[PDB]
Amino acid sequence: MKTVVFAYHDMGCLGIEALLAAGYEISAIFTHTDFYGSVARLAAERGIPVYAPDNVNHPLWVERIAQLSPDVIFSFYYRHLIYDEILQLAPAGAFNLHGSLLPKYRGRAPLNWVLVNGETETGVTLHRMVKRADAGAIVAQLRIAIAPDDIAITLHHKLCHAARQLLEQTLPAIKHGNILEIAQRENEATCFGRRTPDDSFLEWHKPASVLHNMVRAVADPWPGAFSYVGNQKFTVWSSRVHPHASKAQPGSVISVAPLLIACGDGALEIVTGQAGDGITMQGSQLAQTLGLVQGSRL
Ligand SMILES: Nc1nc(=O)c2c([nH]1)NC[C@@H](CNc1ccc(C(=O)N[C@@H](CCC(=O)O)C(=O)O)cc1)N2C=O
Ligand SMILES: O=c1ccn([C@@H]2O[C@H](COP(=O)(O)O)[C@@H](O)[C@H]2O)c(=O)[nH]1
């Protein structure tokens, strides 16, 4: 079974590895220009031609892919929609690996959004690729738990592990044409967009648990959840929830050692953070750096 693969980052690398282990012949990999593994370096080491056009949806790339005669196409965290002109070239179709429990969390950054939203489970889905992103029939799915202390990077690794398992289990079935698919239930679908560093703003009126989830969702090496002291941005890199009710106004500094901020329900301890583009520091030092005192209002 011959394939053309669209791949990026760690999911891209493990998808390529899984295909090679399952005995697929990879004729070409399409990727993007740049902590993640490099699909291009993997392709190069494996002797596979690799290409990173900004937009693969060009007549000449369509023609080129056609000339490679793929049986099947895979996408493993390729970022750009691939037009029907390309997808229809492969007689056995096209499959994508998405990092959520479709039909929930279609779209961008499902790793981060499930954390933002306080989910206790997520998963990986392999589905047929169709014109609408993340919307085609499901062929395999694997559910995993999100632990209360998971952060983006730790959940990322768990999703990668799950993807490897799912692919190892499923790729042989595709190769042999055993491949039941079930349509997604559109009434159950949810979809999320690209996140910017700004979508990680901490709003202190929210429950401490919700703010904690935001901190986890974009913890290092993601860009971090943030607030301000006047013109001074600061990032909360790690936190802990103090569930006890405070009579303090949301955003009030309850204490500076440890740095504890009243929320809409409970309080949030800022365990580590940074002021602006300065270095990471413990919360008590951050408090001093920012000029906060007990009773300061954020
Ligand atoms: N045909 C096809 N189907 C897919 O499911 C699929 C591909 N291609 N290619 C790789 C990838 C692309 N996934 C996505 C996911 C979301 C958007 C999206 O919502 N785009 C918005 C907003 C701008 C943006 O985020 O790019 C839009 O209005 O198009 C696009 C592509 N993908 C499966 O992962
Ligand atoms: O919750 C998120 C998820 C991603 N990004 C940004 O989205 C881009 C895509 O990230 P990759 O998807 O991590 O490249 C990067 O600039 C990344 O920092 C955020 O700001 N917040």
Q: Nearest C-alpha to atom 9 of ligand 1 is from which residue? A: 81
Ligand 2 site, CB within 6 A:
109, 112, 195-197, 218, 222-223
Return the sign of the alpha-carbon dihedral for residues 210, 192, 142, 161: negative
| Parts of the chain belonging to CATH 3.10.25.10 | 197-298
**How many Å apart are CA 252 and CA 179, to the nearest integer?**
56
Return the sign of the alpha-carbon dihedral for residues 196, 202, 203, 208: positive
In the chain, the largest separation of any two C-alpha atoms, in whole Å, equals 69
Q: What is the 3-state secondary structure (H, E, C) of the chain?
A: CEEEEEECHHHHHHHHHHHHHCCCEEEEEECCCCCCCCHHHHHHHHCCCEECCCCCCCHHHHHHHHHCCCCEEEEECCCCCCCHHHHCCCCCCEEEEECCCCCCCEECCHHHHHHHCCCCEEEEEEEECCCCCCCCCEEEEEEEECCCCCCHHHHHHHHHHHHHHHHHHHHHHHHCCCCCCECCCHHHCCEECCCCHHHHECCCCCEHHHHHHHHHHCCCCCCCEEEEECCEEEEEEEEEEECCCCCCCCCEEEEECCEEEECCECEEEEEEEEECCCCEEEHHHHHHHHCCCCCCEC
The technique by which this structure was obtained is X-ray
Q: Is the CB of 105 under 6 A from ligand 1?
A: no
Radius of gyration, CA atoms only, the chain? 22
Out of 3.40.50.720, 3.40.50.300, 1.10.540.10, 3.10.25.10, the CATH code matching 197-298 is: 3.10.25.10
Distance of CA 23 from the midpoint of ligand 1 (Å): 28
Question: Is 254 marked within a binding site?
Answer: no
| Parts of the chain belonging to CATH 3.40.50.170 | 1-196
Ligand 2, atom nearest to 108 Cα: 12
Q: Nearest C-alpha to atom 6 of ligand 2 is from which residue? A: 196
Provide the angle, in degrees to the nearest 10, between the axes of the packed helices 9-21 and 39-46. 30
Distance of CA 65 from the midpoint of ligand 2 (Å): 29
Q: How many CA atoms lie within 13 A of 111 on its CB side?
A: 20
Environment class of residue 34 by beta-carbon count within 10 Å: exposed (0-12), middle (13-18) or buried (19+)? exposed
Ligand 1, atom nearest to 127 Cα: 5
Instruction: List, as own/partner pairs, every contact residues 63-68 make where C-beta atoms lie below 8 angstroms and the sequence separation is at least 24, other chains included.
Output: 65/4, 65/28, 65/89, 68/2, 68/4, 68/27, 68/28
Distance of CA 196 from the midpoint of ligand 2 (Å): 6
The reported resolution of this PDB entry, expressed in Å, is 1.2
Name every residue whose Cβ is closer than 8 Å to that of residue 83 and which is 6 or more positions away in sequence.
57, 62
CA 124 to chain centre: 11
Question: Is 159 marked within a binding site?
Answer: no
In CATH, what is the architecture of 1-196? Answer: 3-Layer(aba) Sandwich (3.40)
Ligand 1, atom nearest to 84 Cα: 1
Residues assigned a catalytic role: 98
Q: Which of 14, 185, 2 is nearest to 101 (CA)?
A: 185
